[PDB]
């Protein structure tokens, strides 16, 4: 199926001919170095890559031959080591001879401080260590939705609170509707996972899948959504029977939440007379666990939102909560995923305080915003090696010579770079080996992931 | 494998309990909206359909699979286990659908229809939006070869006006965005969508993806080079680089070779190593292998001016027919830092002030062409345009197309799409869209050979 020897980038194929003599260690880490600024980062990821693509015998007689074959195609030269993998295959029956440390899946560390670790552990596969970097670098894209999506989730703590004086719900403030705007099935499974990490709502099963699959979860619920209806289905109905459609839909879904456009044709004459009326008496009799949510007009993120919570404020009961501020009906709520983004995310809850509606109110989405448009450069993610042992030397190649992680008593996070590790200072060290020759040695379940990835 | 009623946007999964009663059809398009990048290149649809979408893709075991995984999703039992199971025993599994689309490869003015999709059994009128997912992600690699393109609109441009002609334009930008992308997958898309443009690339995923699903004639479809890199080269130690250095050139010597130079000394490398030391190891290289010199980091546009200059003065350096400076035939450059299409026509602009031959140089483009891009760059948009309820027709950005859509070019070549079946009346060219897959079989499939072809450049 999937061929390693085929996974990494071409002109690192032949670096089993660039290094010195005797060259018999090459040793690689990875980190956000540092440069809404991301001061901290979710660690989280690389099990999926390990898993998926790394452990057992990925080494066989057929995909030495179909490398052979497409590399020689591919540089017009052989310039392929067949001998080298060769060895892998017979000397460890395809396993890889390489060690990697990693922090645990789910930590949160600030900038600038080693993640993980790869190293060769037979000095005859030196050049095993560069040719890895590439599927392991790629670690980079859910460390990164993991963090921007806990970010977006401290906005969200952070009035919640002020709101309404808890942190009840939070976890499904925020809605991943990211599936159409990535660039593929992979990249979306990947990236809704990384999501989960934070919060449940997401319309990307795949995410579901890969978490039960490469992490494993005793939470009943790890992901959900709610029947959605939009413009493609409304206005099949007509303008002339908007209501029918309407009171079709929350009638289908009654022991659910749904969420249902008010944009179709007219939000006033919806919310107010069709909502507001018409259909009444199936609203307000709506559990507090299945209400209907509104989904406001097109136009500005925050004013769509204030308009839609005024104009249902004038047809339904609001009341002021323990904190002081607006609260709609427990059966009765809205849900913005039009333009919100980490910075909007902001200015959208900031306006809905300072207009005295509580956060309760509102959950958000976010599409292309939170999967897409985000890069390696985002949060620096960098792999270097930083160490080399040639002709028994040690050398140094960013950070220099052996690393390892530690927090200090006050609860800061340092990096001890040269081995200086090694004089056990601030404690252990607090990477791990996760994987060493061919075998995941040390796993994490999704809810030790969640735990670690918590709100401090 | 691959399970296709568990890859659609959750909320669409609930929509055969959303519409009217007798909706027969419910008809798609796509397209890249403009406002108030003028052409795309429409690629990469061909890869969903064959991947995903032909065949038998519906069995028991993945309509049970979908039952538990809804069931626990939405905390209660909407999923249509009865209209997937129909299409499992009507149609043995095949998708009941129609796609039409433009030829792949093919260059198409935004604002116009790429792409439709329909269903073809009245039963299965839910099944549009149930696809829109899997379908609309072609804007990833048709922004990518859209991206490619303009970049190679740019490098044409220079290369014919500073050197005459366009040899060796395939050569130009690198694919080096393997290590910048979100996961293997969008990889292999990605290098492919470039691929479609130019020849070179990193990532042999991207040919993997070409032959399996498009096929080529082209003995050499993509291709790569060794290249030397600072953790490489340093391993060596500042007193060795040119050991390092001769090293890699003598082990390397029937192909072009790339070398950064700027592991320590950034003159010396050029001027003592490559120039005093190794002089006879580099002009004594064929044309076809030349020694490749990667500039020093920092702004591109003054690195490329300054590594020119460096071996301009160690080494012989020409005219050609056009006026301008051309290093020997076994030394060029490459930069593949910070280029990006606005970067590209700042460098190759400073290049042509300087009466540098665009000949001299290539680039690379990594994260900053495939994966700095998202479906707004295009405007990519898919979106229902005609209904049928109880036998009855229903229907910032400029405003979407409405009823059945249909490609045309007026007598003067230029491309219109028609709304509301009007194209029926053929006032212009028959259809240009294509039936590219009817109820589970592909009907049309192109050659990455036409592909290509279908994307080359204007003369004018």
Known sequence: EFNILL????????????????????????????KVKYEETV???????????????????????????????????????????????????????????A??????????????????????????????????????????????????????????????????????????????????????????????????????????????????????????????????????????????????????????PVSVVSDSYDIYNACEKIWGEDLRHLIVSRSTEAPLIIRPDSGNPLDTVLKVLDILGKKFPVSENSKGYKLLPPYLRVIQGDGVDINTLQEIVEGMKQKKWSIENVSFGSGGALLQKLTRDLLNCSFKCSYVVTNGLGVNVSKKGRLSLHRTPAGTFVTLEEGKGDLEEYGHDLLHTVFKNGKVTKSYSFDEVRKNAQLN
Do not use: M
């Open 43 to 101: 660690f989280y990821g690389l099990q999926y890559i390990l898993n998926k693509y790394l452990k057992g015998k990925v080494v066989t007689k057929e995909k030495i031959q179909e490398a052979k074959e497409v590399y020689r195609e591919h540089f017009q030269d052989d310039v392929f080591n067949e001998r080298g993998w060769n060895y892998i295959l017979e000397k460890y029956d395809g396993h890889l001879p390489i060690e990697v440390k």
């Open 7 to 34: 996974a990494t980038d071409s002109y690192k194929v032949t670096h089993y001919k660039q290094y010195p003599p005797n060259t018999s260690k090459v040793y690689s880490y990875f980190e956000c170095r540092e």
């Open 103 to 256: 922090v645990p899946e789910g930590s949160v560390i600030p900038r600038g401080n080693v993640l993980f670790t790869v190293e060769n552990t037979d000095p005859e596969c030196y050049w095993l260590t560069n040719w890895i970097e590439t599927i392991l670098v790629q670690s980079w894209y859910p460390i990164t939705v993991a963090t921007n999506s806990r970010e977006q989730k401290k906005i969200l703590a952070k009035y919640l609170l002020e709101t309404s004086g808890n942190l009840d719900g939070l976890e499904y403030k925020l809605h991943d509707f990211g599936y159409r705007g990535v660039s593929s099935q992979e990249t979306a499974g990947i990236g809704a996972s990384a999501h989960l990490v934070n919060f449940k709502g997401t319309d990307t099963v795949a995410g579901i899948a890969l978490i039960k699959k490469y992490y494993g979860t005793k939470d009943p619920v790890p992901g959900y959504s709610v029947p959605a209806a939009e413009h493609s289905t409304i206005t099949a109905w007509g303008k002339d029977h908007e209501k029918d459609a309407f009171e079709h839909i929350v009638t289908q879904f009654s022991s659910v």
